[PDB]
Amino acid sequence: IRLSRSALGTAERRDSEVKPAKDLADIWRVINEVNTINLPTFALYNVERSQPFNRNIKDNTGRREERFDAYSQTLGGA
């Protein structure tokens, strides 16, 4: 998998070749929706954690008991 990016204000553009990642994750999703399988857990825990905790923030969208909610904001920091 290759993530490529050209600089801003440049006529030449570079594309990203993510096709084997697309193929493998498409395979995982297709086999899961046919007959339920265990999925890999990708997580990033950056310095973006150590935020203060407030119990009152409870309202959210996504139905937390949904299994595919486990991938909800799994990367990107805290």
Site residues (vs a copy of itself, CB under 8 A)? 56-60
Q: Which is nearer to a copy of itself, 38 or 60 (CB)?
A: 60
| Three-class DSSP category at 57 | coil
Question: How far, in Å, CA of 20 to CA of 28, rounded?
Answer: 12
Select 51 or 60, whichever has its Cβ closest to a copy of itself: 60
Distance of alpha carbon 2 from alpha carbon 20, whole angstroms: 10
Q: How far is the CB of 74 from a copy of itself (least distance, A)?
A: 24
- To a copy of itself, the closest distance from the beta carbon of 57 in angstroms equals 7
Residue 47 structure tokens: 């310095």
